[PDB]
Amino acid sequence: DWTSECDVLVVGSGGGALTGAYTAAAQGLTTIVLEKTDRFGGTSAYSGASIWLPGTQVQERAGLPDSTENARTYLRALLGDAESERQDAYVETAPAVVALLEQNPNIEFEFRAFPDYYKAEGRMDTGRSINPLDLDPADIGDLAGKVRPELDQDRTGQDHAPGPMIGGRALIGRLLAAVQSTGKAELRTESVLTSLIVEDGRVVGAEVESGGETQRIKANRGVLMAAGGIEGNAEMREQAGTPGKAIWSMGPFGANTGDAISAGIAVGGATALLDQAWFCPGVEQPDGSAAFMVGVRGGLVVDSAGERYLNESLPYDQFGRAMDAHDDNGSAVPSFMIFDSREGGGLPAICIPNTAPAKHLEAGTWVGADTLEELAAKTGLPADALRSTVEKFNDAAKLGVDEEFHRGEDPYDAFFCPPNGGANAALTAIENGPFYAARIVLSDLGTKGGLVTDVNGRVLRADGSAIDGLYAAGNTSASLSGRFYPGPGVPLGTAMVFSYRAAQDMAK
Amino acid sequence: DWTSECDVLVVGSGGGALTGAYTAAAQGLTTIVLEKTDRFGGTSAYSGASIWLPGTQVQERAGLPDSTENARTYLRALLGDAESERQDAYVETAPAVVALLEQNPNIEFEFRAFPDYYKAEGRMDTGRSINPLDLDPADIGDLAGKVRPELDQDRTGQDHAPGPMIGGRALIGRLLAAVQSTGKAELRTESVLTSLIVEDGRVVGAEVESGGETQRIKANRGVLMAAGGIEGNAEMREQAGTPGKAIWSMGPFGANTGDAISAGIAVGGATALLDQAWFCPGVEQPDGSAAFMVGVRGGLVVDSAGERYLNESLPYDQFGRAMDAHDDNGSAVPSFMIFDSREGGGLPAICIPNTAPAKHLEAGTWVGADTLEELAAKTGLPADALRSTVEKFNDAAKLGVDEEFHRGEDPYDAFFCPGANAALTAIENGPFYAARIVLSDLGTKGGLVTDVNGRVLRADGSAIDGLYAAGNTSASLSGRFYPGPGVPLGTAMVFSYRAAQDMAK
Amino acid sequence: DWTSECDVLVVGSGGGALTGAYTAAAQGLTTIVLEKTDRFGGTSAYSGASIWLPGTQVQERAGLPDSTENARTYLRALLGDAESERQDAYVETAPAVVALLEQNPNIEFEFRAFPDYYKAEGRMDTGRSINPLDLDPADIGDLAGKVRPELDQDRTGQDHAPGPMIGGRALIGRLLAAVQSTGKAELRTESVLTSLIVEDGRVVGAEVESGGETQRIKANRGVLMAAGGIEGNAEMREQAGTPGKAIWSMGPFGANTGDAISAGIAVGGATALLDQAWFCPGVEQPDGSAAFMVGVRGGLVVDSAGERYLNESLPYDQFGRAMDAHDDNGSAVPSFMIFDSREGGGLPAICIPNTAPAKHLEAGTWVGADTLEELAAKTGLPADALRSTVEKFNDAAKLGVDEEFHRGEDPYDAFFCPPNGGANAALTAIENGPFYAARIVLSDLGTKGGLVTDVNGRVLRADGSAIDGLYAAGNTSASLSGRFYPGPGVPLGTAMVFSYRAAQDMAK
Amino acid sequence: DWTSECDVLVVGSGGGALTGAYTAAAQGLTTIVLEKTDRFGGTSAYSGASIWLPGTQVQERAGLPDSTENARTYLRALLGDAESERQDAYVETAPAVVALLEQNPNIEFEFRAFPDYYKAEGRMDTGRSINPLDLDPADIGDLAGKVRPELDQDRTGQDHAPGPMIGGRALIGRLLAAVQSTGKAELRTESVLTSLIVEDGRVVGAEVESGGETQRIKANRGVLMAAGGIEGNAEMREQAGTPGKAIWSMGPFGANTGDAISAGIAVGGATALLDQAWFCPGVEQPDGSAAFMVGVRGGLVVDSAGERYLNESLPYDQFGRAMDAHDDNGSAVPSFMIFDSREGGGLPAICIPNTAPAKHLEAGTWVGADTLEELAAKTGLPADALRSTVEKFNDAAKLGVDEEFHRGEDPYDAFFCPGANAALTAIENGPFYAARIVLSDLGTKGGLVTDVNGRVLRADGSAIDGLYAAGNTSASLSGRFYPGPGVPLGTAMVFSYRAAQDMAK
């Protein structure tokens, strides 16, 4: 009846999953990791691998003036008392996770400056998040070729480009090497959770599609589901009311289709926040997909009425939420990013992946013109309003103050701007034609709604009771952060901590 | 009838071109740089930016036991006395080029291990070549977006990926920043050399297509042509007898079409070595192009007869030359690289760009099968010979010695592998694959004949006043050899520097 | 009559002087540099060599989001319109000075983070100042031994310690090499300006003591006096009303005695701001001298009444000005810095030079005790008030807020604090005895009052007319900054810019 | 009866001690480190932190052409077969020590050029030694203030000067951070080993003076004694026949008084090489102490007869041994270093600490004069012989050859000089100076006899169960030789590691 057996079964292979697998296997529990696709890492592999794990040994090594209490204060100020026990667990457990992981020879992190996202008590203007060190692929043997490549390769039919592995690729490559090095773990690809197996009300294993045949895998201590969210499932998204679209999502196409969330619902798990995501603006691509637009450093953005309606330097989640809030039947989705030839026709932001302007212009996702009047005609924006919007923005750039949306009055805004700008580095006149308009959509970096869990990642029913044997973390679980993206690395940070805590709970 | 005027006119924007431009502009000479395409850097931007500039302050900072004389000895042992004065100038001038460049705040290099390519007196088993440090694109302002991206982006309709600029992108980004910082240089894109202008036998400027209109640009001290070779021009290649093909060349598509070489011929410049290139094996792509295959660490390679015929770990240029030497009317071009599923279906080498196996298999550039017999059928190799070739190779892997081609008896071979011999691994865990391998290049190396200061020479050895060439616009001093990593950029940089110094006299 | 002749005669050898000398000699003017002592560099050699030269090529190479207009805006917000033409000249000329200097093979700078000092529009929280790169002494031949050593060597009978030359030593070593490399400059030590020589109302040279003989040196284009301020002259200081004391000054003992200022007065030069200095708190030394106290990270400070009266994390100039403002006949000079044994008896700040606690305690500059009551007795502070002051501060540390002086509500305050948990990194309880009290005095990093100059460094008479042939910069000139120390590197930055401009003017 | 207990008790806090403590605590053994003074690091903190740990991952990252066998060959050629098993263990274990340490986030090293000290097979002319990276003190929290400061601060009543921590301060700061980070170690200052405690013939702990009260600390696996040598104990030195003097030693004043060696003798430990030290010339200071003189780049040295008697560019240990060999009742100790005003009155060498010439001249340690005749009078050297010695040296400088002592015929000699021979410079531009030079040391190197795992041995070669020694508490495997930069720290680190590994079995 059972095909194989282990102490801890982990579904998924993102940062959280592999951290949970490591925590279990490092303390002697046999572990099996199941990855649906032919590559480990999921969206985590795509990530910059910034991780919000504050007040740990890593920041101490950088002399950073911060602490557990300062971080706790920051979360409380943003989130309120909703999920305060989970906020506490997140912050307090960070040091221990980092310490455990850094004990492994394959893992080292460092602090990297990148500001927290909201003005509030406890904010770090330079940030407090950490990153895995760049990784020479030869140092993890055959595992490197099993890591999912960066977006600029993975959506163009390519594997890893010739540099070292960095960001998400370093994170996942290092985590895989550490998991393997325990000698207690089995890492499987093309292995898909189908449903959970319950005996006497306790989750005791799972049914799994692999090699076209069904398997039943027994989990003596428990099952950690960290298999992403619903971002790739248009139906579940429509049903929940999630904004954006599956095709605009920056998750790997077809990977995160809400399987683990559904499997948990099927055994009694409650859910929450299904209409929420980790939002971001996306540059629409020729093929209908999107690219993560981050680090805006010029231009402005208008609705279909040719009017500005938000601070374009806002952090990506807040930018996205502002698009959705303003949207009336497609009036803000798409929005149009307007810019001049200051950067040779480049869009003044970082786009991931980074499709050449020529390709966008061929396809009509972007449009160019010698005057704002033509640009309006070609995009359907009112000519007079566009013209007017730009003149007004340019006036604001000259004075160095944006009275309307207060762009450039925040360290996040300033962090990305190049030198020799002007009075305000975030406000630069749009005036040296040709002029361009790029379509911007409501992308995501994964959804953040899912199964309700407690401080140790146990999945809960509607009455708050724990489903024995079942755990969830990362975007399979409803995030403690609610409607907020507090700073860089929260999605990976929360995924990693609660995967660790769930593995610790299974070890008791 | 002059549109504009300058002291030094530089055609091209590769490593050499920008080094020449910097050398001129740093000492006060007004300089104009003309790049044909919309991006600076050419093939140099694609490069790993390893540079063979031995015995300089950079290697001293790394405590490297090497010297000018040791490097000279290495070149003499490989190349003989052919072009010995240029060998001497190359080696002796390296320190000064590096010193000048590193005085600019935007430029720093470091030593990076990568072995020289031939067993000979003066070889460095760990290498002596240097590289520019990684560069944060925000540190050179608007120039970063004007640098040609890496191959893995540039042939898939993409710009720079999110990391730092490294290799050729660091080299060109840093060189551009240094050239701009002089305040004496004008950097132009979409500006194409059409022909040279001569008055009383001296090159005094050039005719240039830009903005759809013709321009005439005056060069008081001279014209440095470092606009690449003929690699992208099938006609010139066929006429010269150059092996390989334009479509297989790793140069940027349509950029290096021999324009500067032709313009030099047109005014009396002699040429040499036009049938030579910087060769490399290439993995054939679905669209007919190729990818640079370097750092082989497994598999074996067979001709169309299903037989091994070379050491597959040879340096890329020597590998290429071996393909050409063995080729009888397509018997070795293509060759087939045979490998198993040890790396999950990946090919056991570094391929640039790195197209996924699935794409190759969909297109038929690669072919897969559960047995060697089916693999033979699907590729048109003899089944018996293939089967036999593999069994024999696997025996050699087990013993740790390849008696037939001596693979794995050299530090280059070992450098890319952490078994009895790291370079010899049995092919046995199906599915099995065969990938088509072609005769690619990293640019051609034939061109205008020059002297030690880069002056272009006529057939009688006299110098064409006012005209200079370096990089692949010039015939390389290295003849039929690729001595070690970084020679193409190294020679381009030194002679571009020396030409600028000559124009300054 | 004339002993020798040159185009440009430079008096002094600090950062300004050598920058002026370079600017002249690089464009073909014969130059003679006169240094009073046996070593080049003065207080500039002692410095950290942070230089406030905003919006230049150096910051562009670090991607810094700042500009000339932003820096101008910062100065205007602090200084008002007093000296606005000089503010403009300072900011606008920075790029050209840096460019000229970096064109020399011996000179390179880099940006280094260190915050600006006042909350105001145009502030850089991370800073915008630059520094010379560390220098291997072998790279400038015999010149290295002619540079004045750092404070931690120069006041203890020592020459350079074994590392590379850094901070001020790098600055002066590199500047000297660049000046020498022109082949147009003569660098002299033990050569003292005595007085200026005037013919038909124009300064045409100077009288100079060297080798015990008097010399008369002719200056065809002019004389640049950048020979420091009056900091080492108790008489001039007392006459002008300058706070602090010569003995407490961090300038080299006996070097900057106001000679150039006096020589300028003697030929009609007006003066201003003679009662102002670049102030800082100083840790009183056994021998009566002081040490620059910067980067406070703990403790508190009380007046003679045992009460706090300032934010102890203030920038050093502001801290100093607060000491002087509060001082009533020695009630705040000295003040007492109170701290516990958290750092093993070390004082929680950077002190330059860094005299060991044992030496202070032996001499009585510092005093230690097991209880605050004894500590009070031994220092003459009221026991009740001290006890009370500390309890209240410790309460504030526990809450993480200092309601009384708002310490730790500013990026400068936070910049120096180590991670030590705690709600606020700048507030740490004083509680683990023994307890110590260190005497703190009103030190300086030079005075800033002097000869009135225009935008090209010409010395002016009371009516604003220019004294033909005479220029001043650095602390020989009255600073454009008035009563403010805007940020790190202003003293060197102003000295360098106006020395450059003066040399350019002489070249016309 | 026991005050506290641990698995591994380490006495001392130099590079060896902390490496041993780390090796133990990193693999889960509870560790207690005892430092006698109020600061960690001892002489190791003073050091340049050059470390002779050849053939490791660090040198591979620098592309250095060297290996374990090459280094072994070097040691064998110098030392012979005396202690060959320990030579082997030293060389073979270097990679593993470096690898373990560099796995800690707080530790990173890099190769830094500095030549090996003897002409012999296996020598590296550029060196093979490594150094810890410079360290920002804020990165190790409260530990920075617990590291002993550099000599130029520590003997003048000062703490750390304002730069980053470098050399020995970086080494010790980084090692302390790594030891603390394990969470298995307790670091104690002002805790002095008094004597060892033995039960049933096995060392099981130690008695320790701390806080004016005696403590007894139990060591379940063992006691590593790495508490320096006898350098600061004039009695033990005189008894053993050690040349030089305690006050001239560059160790911290009063720290290394041979306590651990005596404690080991008291329980049966044999000793060897007590008359040997890591010698160096020292510049005599006004207060009677000395300063390490290294990197001589000019001048010459005479005995009290006004005659040269050695190559002044010899490595410091060889220089010292030559002073001792020539000494007849003070005829060479002191010697006089003679130099001109080429460097403005500076002495042409690096001196640590670096006392100003004015201070020496006030005190009469140095003497200056306008002629060699006056200089001779003021120092008591024969005028004729001095004059004659200098003329002859200046002739040798003009030819570029020193026939008498062969100065400047070796890469060490040249390394410190940027003339026909860079190491030979005429002494001719007055004023002239004579500085007194004495026989200093960088610690003594005699001590307890140990085996390849650092176990302390009795006279018959049997191991004293539970007792280990490394660094200068142990008799060095190097005998009468200082092979190259970093041997003292290198040996201390390797055998401390091995001892901790042996305790872990």
Ligand SMILES: C[C@]12C=CC(=O)C=C1CC[C@@H]1[C@@H]2CC[C@]2(C)C(=O)CC[C@@H]12
């Ligand atoms: C000579 C020495 C000492 C003992 C040893 O074993 C190895 C070395 C080499 C490194 C130098 C050090 C002495 C101090 C030096 C000169 C520095 O201050 C910088 C480099 C250091």
Ligand code: NA
């Ligand atoms: Na790509």
